[PDB]
Design a protein around this nucleic acid. Sequence first.
DNA 1: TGCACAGGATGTATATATCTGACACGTGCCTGGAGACTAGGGAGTAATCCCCTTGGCGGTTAAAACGCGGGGGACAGCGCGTACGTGCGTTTAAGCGGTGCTAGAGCTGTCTACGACCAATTGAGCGGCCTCGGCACCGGGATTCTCCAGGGC
DNA 2: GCCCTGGAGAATCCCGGTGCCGAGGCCGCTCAATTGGTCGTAGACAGCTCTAGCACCGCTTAAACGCACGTACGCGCTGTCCCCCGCGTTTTAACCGCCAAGGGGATTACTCCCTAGTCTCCAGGCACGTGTCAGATATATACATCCTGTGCA
Lengths: 98, 97, 96, 96, 81, 81, 110, 110
Amino acid sequence: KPHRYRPGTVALREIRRYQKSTELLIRKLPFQRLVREIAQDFKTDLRFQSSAVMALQEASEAYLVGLFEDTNLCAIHAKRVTIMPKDIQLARRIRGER
Amino acid sequence: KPHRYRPGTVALREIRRYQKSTELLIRKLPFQRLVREIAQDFKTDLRFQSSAVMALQEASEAYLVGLFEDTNLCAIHAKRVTIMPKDIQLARRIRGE
Amino acid sequence: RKTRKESYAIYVYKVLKQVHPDTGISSKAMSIMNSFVNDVFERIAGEASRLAHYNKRSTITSREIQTAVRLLLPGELAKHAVSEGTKAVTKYTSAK
Amino acid sequence: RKTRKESYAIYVYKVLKQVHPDTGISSKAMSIMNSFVNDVFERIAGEASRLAHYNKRSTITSREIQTAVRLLLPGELAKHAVSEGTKAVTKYTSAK
Amino acid sequence: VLRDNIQGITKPAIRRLARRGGVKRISGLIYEETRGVLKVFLENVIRDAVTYTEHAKRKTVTAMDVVYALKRQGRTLYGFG
Amino acid sequence: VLRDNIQGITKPAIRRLARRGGVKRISGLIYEETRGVLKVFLENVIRDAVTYTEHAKRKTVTAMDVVYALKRQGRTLYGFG
Amino acid sequence: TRAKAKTRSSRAGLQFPVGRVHRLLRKGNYAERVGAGAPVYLAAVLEYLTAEILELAGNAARDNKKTRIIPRHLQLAVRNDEELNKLLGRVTIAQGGVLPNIQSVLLPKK
Amino acid sequence: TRAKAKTRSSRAGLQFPVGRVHRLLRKGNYAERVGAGAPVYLAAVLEYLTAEILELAGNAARDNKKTRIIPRHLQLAVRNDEELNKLLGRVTIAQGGVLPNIQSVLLPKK
DNA sequence: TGCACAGGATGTATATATCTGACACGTGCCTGGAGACTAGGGAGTAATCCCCTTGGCGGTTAAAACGCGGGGGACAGCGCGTACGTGCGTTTAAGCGGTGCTAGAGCTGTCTACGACCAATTGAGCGGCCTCGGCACCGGGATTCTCCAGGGC
DNA sequence: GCCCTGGAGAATCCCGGTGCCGAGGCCGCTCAATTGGTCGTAGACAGCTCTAGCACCGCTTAAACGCACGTACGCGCTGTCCCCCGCGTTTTAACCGCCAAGGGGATTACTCCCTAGTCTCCAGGCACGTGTCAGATATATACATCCTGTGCA
């Protein structure tokens, strides 16, 4: 009796919404903490420009979005609609990163 | 009863042989004619160096072999053992061509 | 007073006012366009440098730039770019 | 006679006699090694040139070569190359 | 020192990235894989950026360093310098 | 004037390439698709090589021109110069 | 006495700076010498490319019902024009988003 | 009088030509000035890389019962070493072939 | 009666003998590298300013997390029919070797027009400033799409 | 029992009104581009040699081509179940604004050391010539591999 959308309607809705928007999708403070942690291993007491952290975020998001596009293509080639770690790995091996 | 090998034994044998060898696998005169025909559309009365055509052939074989490796990977991803035009197209799409 | 920085912003604005008179641009978009002009400059100039070295020449000329444009641009863009550059050089030679 | 062409063949042969005293090399393999040395030279020199331009300097120095080696080589290759280059520069400064 | 910061990239964030990528259904094992891939990419870029910063004799990593590292990796970014 | 020279690549040669690539079974449409792919690649490289030849004011394409074109496309070739 | 100064950009009919391009060519370690027509050719080519991108971006902004061009409009122009997509295929545009694209197998079965 | 000439390569302890590398750096349009230790460092690095590749290729030739290195042995060395493969990941070696790799699903079932 | 085995056939690795042509060395010469020196500017160093990075605190919500119910998609199993592999006989050019010819690459000598270099002058382009309208946000009403309950065929 | 359809209901679109902050224009000044002239060399140009790319022929034979058969494999279908999705509630920590302190980037003046530029001198590296041994090829042999007919536990 309570309203329920079927499994996939809301997912298509989110696809349209986030393909229409342009804003960053990860949280800024957690991403910054991750970047500082990764940089610890390369040099100690490093300082970061805010624009530097923002540029890193934009690059990482663009990379991940393109990777997920290729992953979806691989999954569809396997006659699936669910993306899987093997789809990610096949995309990275065809791109030439592993 | 004449001897026959099963369908795939000779194919694996050919795989091992041609992965052991280093020679060029396309015929040189047909490749040269193809190269001259393609260059014909960019300039007339063009002359070629033997080393130019040989370099072109080496690059073309290297490209096709790498593409076929990626195609086999895609076909295996699709739970097949036969490579297909869809596999070639997907490989080229993920490569960026 | 802050030190002087150079950008292609005023020229980008001039070209924008030529093609779309009632249209403007934001600061981020101007930054992107400045980056685009710099990138294209570096690509063309590096290719011309390599061509001059390949031919054992000491000078970068209009024909080096033309060949670099033909090598770097995709097709119709290349032929229209060649037309524009040839026209500009002819007009410059006619003037002075 | 023909005009002289420089190559790295005699130096590659010297290193081959250092590492494998009883092994020879064919002319095609020597061509490949010549191409490899020219490629690595061009890569490192270009990275150093870009570093100097980025930092607003007119001189390519050992600092630029070390940084370019770090950028262009993967891991242990970079570590050992940096060790070798520092050794050579120290020996040169000791000598003259 | 900082620890466990890869978990600040959360499942809903990976879902939003996948939706922008056009993904309808996501497997539960995707999130750890994406965390590993992101860590690899970030490590490469940050290594190159810190190398640039050290050559300049600076203690602060700048947007120009990030842009140079991305350009070295063939991932040119517009709009930061 | 040359015509009908892409058919000289022939099915057995494409099959030999696919064997060196490590494949076991081949479809019938693969041969035509591979002919098209090879033609595209050759057109790109030969166009660039003729551009280099025309810049040098030469009527002969050289191994150097081919190497420079392949290096322009990120496909460096060792062993010809 | 000395004549009135004209810019080489005005002599060539361009809105891009010929003299600045010449200085950048001379100080960029490209060759030992730079010809006189090379900066003219290069400035003309840069102007043409800029005009192409700006025209397409302004069209996209008009479609969005905006007067100001933004990075979203720049990205839409680039990714929708095929030759500019080939030229800039390896470039990332900050705050540019992606094109709307859903694969037809994911759409509800109708 | 002037002394007997020593080469900078012998001063550095190297088998690679320091002065030739210096001349190439000077005529290559990389910067306005070249320091004294830059060719020394560059020649040392080039020698080290050549030594690594030649060592692996000589080992590969020894496994073949040959005394001369050939392009096939060079390719085997490069493709079997992980860091060298990363360094030469988009280079084609003429007459080198491929590595012997067959996928496991294509092998016959026991 | 479905799963080892024997044995036959086929392909492949191994050892030995001939032969040739390409590698490795020696020689002569020339041109590019080394030695010695001068002059000038790039960069190292010190000192100083002020921007911007970091760190902390508190309140407000948006967003993440956690659990739950159920539908739909992944995956395994089965059957069919066709498309590809394997082998055989016929046909077609490929490769190889000769010869002959000439176009064009490569090099040399001459000389002139073009680009570096320099000094002096000025206006275009940049920084700082100030203002207004394009856009972001809000709220309310209209339209569209999704889903299910219910009834006709 | 299956397909169509009308209402709910949720989401999106559209419209109208407000506030604000960033684009756009203005103004002063200073640094870089322009002007006019000189000079020395790179490149345009003509001439000439000789290499190599093209063209033709004839023969041998490897490789392509066409065909027939059968068998694995691609593909479609069906059924199970479990895992991911949509939704509702609770909890966390992002986020925003504000404040304060100090590190470190950015600039400037100064001086010295390093590097370019020149000239002379010569030895190291390139081209050429020659000989001998590693590798390619034949050939016969021994061994590993595959496939099926056969028997039984």
